[PDB]
Design an enzyme around this catalytic site. Structure first.
Site, PDB file in Angstrom:
ATOM      1  N   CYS A  44      27.554  35.232 -19.437  1.00  0.00           N
ATOM      2  CA  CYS A  44      27.023  35.447 -20.771  1.00  0.00           C
ATOM      3  C   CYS A  44      25.909  36.493 -20.791  1.00  0.00           C
ATOM      4  CB  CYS A  44      26.481  34.143 -21.377  1.00  0.00           C
ATOM      5  SG  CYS A  44      27.727  32.820 -21.426  1.00  0.00           S
ATOM      6  N   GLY A  45      25.317  36.769 -19.633  1.00  0.00           N
ATOM      7  CA  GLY A  45      24.342  37.840 -19.484  1.00  0.00           C
ATOM      8  C   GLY A  45      23.196  37.399 -18.599  1.00  0.00           C
TER       9      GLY A  45
END
Length: 163
Positions: free
Chosen positions: A39-40
Protein backbone atom coordinates in the site's frame (compact mmCIF):
# COMPACT_ATOMS: atom_id res chain seq x y z
CA UNK A 1 1.43 -29.80 18.14
CA UNK A 2 2.68 -31.09 21.47
CA UNK A 3 5.50 -32.82 19.71
CA UNK A 4 6.48 -29.87 17.53
CA UNK A 5 10.12 -28.99 18.06
CA UNK A 6 11.02 -26.94 14.97
CA UNK A 7 9.45 -25.13 12.01
CA UNK A 8 10.40 -28.08 9.80
CA UNK A 9 7.52 -30.04 11.33
CA UNK A 10 5.06 -27.86 9.33
CA UNK A 11 3.56 -27.96 5.83
CA UNK A 12 4.40 -25.05 3.49
CA UNK A 13 3.19 -24.41 0.00
CA UNK A 14 4.95 -21.88 -2.26
CA UNK A 15 3.19 -19.14 -4.22
CA UNK A 16 2.16 -21.61 -6.96
CA UNK A 17 0.75 -23.87 -4.30
CA UNK A 18 3.37 -26.53 -4.73
CA UNK A 19 4.99 -28.20 -1.76
CA UNK A 20 7.91 -26.12 -0.62
CA UNK A 21 11.16 -27.74 0.58
CA UNK A 22 11.43 -25.84 3.86
CA UNK A 23 13.96 -28.25 5.30
CA UNK A 24 16.44 -27.06 2.63
CA UNK A 25 16.98 -24.12 5.00
CA UNK A 26 17.85 -26.26 8.04
CA UNK A 27 21.41 -25.70 9.35
CA UNK A 28 21.41 -21.96 8.73
CA UNK A 29 19.29 -19.26 10.39
CA UNK A 30 16.39 -17.58 8.67
CA UNK A 31 13.84 -14.80 9.18
CA UNK A 32 10.12 -15.41 8.59
CA UNK A 33 7.93 -12.46 7.87
CA UNK A 34 4.17 -12.10 7.37
CA UNK A 35 3.39 -9.63 4.55
CA UNK A 36 0.42 -8.17 2.74
CA UNK A 37 -0.26 -6.17 -0.47
CA UNK A 38 1.88 -3.10 -1.13
CA UNK A 39 0.00 0.00 0.00
CA UNK A 40 3.07 2.24 0.29
CA UNK A 41 4.25 1.79 3.95
CA UNK A 42 5.73 -1.10 6.01
CA UNK A 43 7.29 0.72 9.07
CA UNK A 44 10.67 -0.06 7.52
CA UNK A 45 9.96 -3.83 7.29
CA UNK A 46 10.42 -4.15 3.56
CA UNK A 47 13.73 -2.31 3.66
CA UNK A 48 14.93 -4.27 6.68
CA UNK A 49 14.01 -7.71 5.29
CA UNK A 50 15.59 -6.94 1.89
CA UNK A 51 18.73 -5.48 3.36
CA UNK A 52 19.28 -8.52 5.61
CA UNK A 53 18.46 -10.98 2.83
CA UNK A 54 20.96 -9.45 0.39
CA UNK A 55 23.62 -8.93 3.04
CA UNK A 56 23.60 -12.47 4.43
CA UNK A 57 22.13 -14.86 1.85
CA UNK A 58 25.74 -15.66 0.81
CA UNK A 59 26.38 -17.01 4.29
CA UNK A 60 23.39 -19.39 3.96
CA UNK A 61 20.65 -17.18 5.43
CA UNK A 62 17.20 -16.70 3.90
CA UNK A 63 14.10 -14.58 4.41
CA UNK A 64 10.71 -16.21 3.76
CA UNK A 65 7.49 -14.19 3.35
CA UNK A 66 3.98 -15.45 4.14
CA UNK A 67 1.30 -13.12 2.75
CA UNK A 68 -1.97 -12.94 4.69
CA UNK A 69 -5.12 -14.02 2.82
CA UNK A 70 -6.91 -11.10 4.58
CA UNK A 71 -9.82 -13.39 5.41
CA UNK A 72 -11.94 -12.97 8.52
CA UNK A 73 -11.37 -9.53 10.02
CA UNK A 74 -8.58 -10.47 12.41
CA UNK A 75 -5.50 -10.49 10.15
CA UNK A 76 -2.53 -8.27 10.88
CA UNK A 77 -2.75 -4.59 10.19
CA UNK A 78 -5.66 -2.34 9.45
CA UNK A 79 -8.54 -4.10 7.75
CA UNK A 80 -9.84 -0.96 6.08
CA UNK A 81 -6.51 -0.09 4.46
CA UNK A 82 -7.04 -2.39 1.47
CA UNK A 83 -10.64 -1.30 1.25
CA UNK A 84 -9.88 2.43 1.24
CA UNK A 85 -6.72 2.49 -0.84
CA UNK A 86 -5.16 0.94 -3.91
CA UNK A 87 -2.61 -1.62 -2.86
CA UNK A 88 -0.80 -3.81 -5.38
CA UNK A 89 0.72 -7.29 -5.44
CA UNK A 90 3.64 -7.73 -3.04
CA UNK A 91 7.00 -8.31 -4.75
CA UNK A 92 10.43 -9.14 -3.36
CA UNK A 93 13.86 -10.65 -4.01
CA UNK A 94 13.27 -13.35 -1.36
CA UNK A 95 10.75 -16.26 -1.51
CA UNK A 96 7.08 -15.57 -1.05
CA UNK A 97 4.80 -18.37 -0.03
CA UNK A 98 1.14 -19.06 -0.73
CA UNK A 99 -1.39 -16.92 1.25
CA UNK A 100 -2.35 -18.12 4.73
CA UNK A 101 -4.31 -17.01 7.82
CA UNK A 102 -1.84 -15.94 10.44
CA UNK A 103 -4.48 -15.19 13.11
CA UNK A 104 -7.88 -16.64 14.09
CA UNK A 105 -9.40 -20.09 14.14
CA UNK A 106 -7.84 -21.06 10.87
CA UNK A 107 -4.36 -19.75 11.70
CA UNK A 108 -1.71 -21.85 9.88
CA UNK A 109 -0.15 -24.27 12.40
CA UNK A 110 3.39 -23.01 11.68
CA UNK A 111 2.20 -19.58 12.86
CA UNK A 112 0.45 -21.10 15.90
CA UNK A 113 3.74 -22.70 16.73
CA UNK A 114 5.96 -19.61 16.23
CA UNK A 115 3.47 -17.32 18.03
CA UNK A 116 3.21 -19.48 21.10
CA UNK A 117 6.97 -20.07 21.15
CA UNK A 118 7.67 -16.32 20.92
CA UNK A 119 4.51 -14.54 22.03
CA UNK A 120 6.16 -11.13 22.03
CA UNK A 121 5.90 -8.54 24.83
CA UNK A 122 3.02 -6.38 23.52
CA UNK A 123 -0.55 -7.53 24.27
CA UNK A 124 -1.33 -11.11 23.19
CA UNK A 125 0.54 -13.52 20.92
CA UNK A 126 -1.54 -12.41 17.96
CA UNK A 127 0.37 -10.96 15.04
CA UNK A 128 -0.58 -7.25 15.12
CA UNK A 129 1.45 -5.85 12.24
CA UNK A 130 2.36 -6.55 8.66
CA UNK A 131 6.11 -7.36 8.48
CA UNK A 132 6.34 -8.89 11.94
CA UNK A 133 9.14 -11.49 11.85
CA UNK A 134 10.47 -14.49 13.64
CA UNK A 135 14.19 -15.27 13.78
CA UNK A 136 14.77 -19.01 13.47
CA UNK A 137 18.04 -20.72 14.58
CA UNK A 138 20.17 -23.41 12.87
CA UNK A 139 17.85 -26.11 14.34
CA UNK A 140 14.61 -24.50 13.06
CA UNK A 141 13.63 -23.13 16.48
CA UNK A 142 12.04 -19.62 16.79
CA UNK A 143 14.34 -17.56 19.05
CA UNK A 144 13.14 -13.94 18.59
CA UNK A 145 10.00 -12.09 17.48
CA UNK A 146 10.59 -8.64 15.92
CA UNK A 147 8.13 -5.83 15.25
CA UNK A 148 8.22 -4.38 11.72
CA UNK A 149 10.07 -1.26 12.77
CA UNK A 150 12.99 -3.32 14.19
CA UNK A 151 16.25 -1.95 12.90
CA UNK A 152 18.82 -3.91 10.91
CA UNK A 153 21.20 -3.44 13.87
CA UNK A 154 18.71 -4.86 16.40
CA UNK A 155 18.18 -7.94 14.28
CA UNK A 156 21.91 -8.31 13.56
CA UNK A 157 22.62 -8.41 17.35
CA UNK A 158 20.72 -11.73 17.40
CA UNK A 159 21.45 -13.02 13.86
CA UNK A 160 25.24 -12.65 13.60
CA UNK A 161 26.00 -15.08 16.42
CA UNK A 162 23.62 -17.55 14.67
CA UNK A 163 25.55 -17.18 11.52
Amino acid sequence: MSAASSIFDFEVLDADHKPYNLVQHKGSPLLIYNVASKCGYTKGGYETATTLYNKYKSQGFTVLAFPSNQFGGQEPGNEEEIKEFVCTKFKAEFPIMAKINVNGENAHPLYEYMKKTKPGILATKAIKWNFTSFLIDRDGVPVERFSPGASVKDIEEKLIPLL
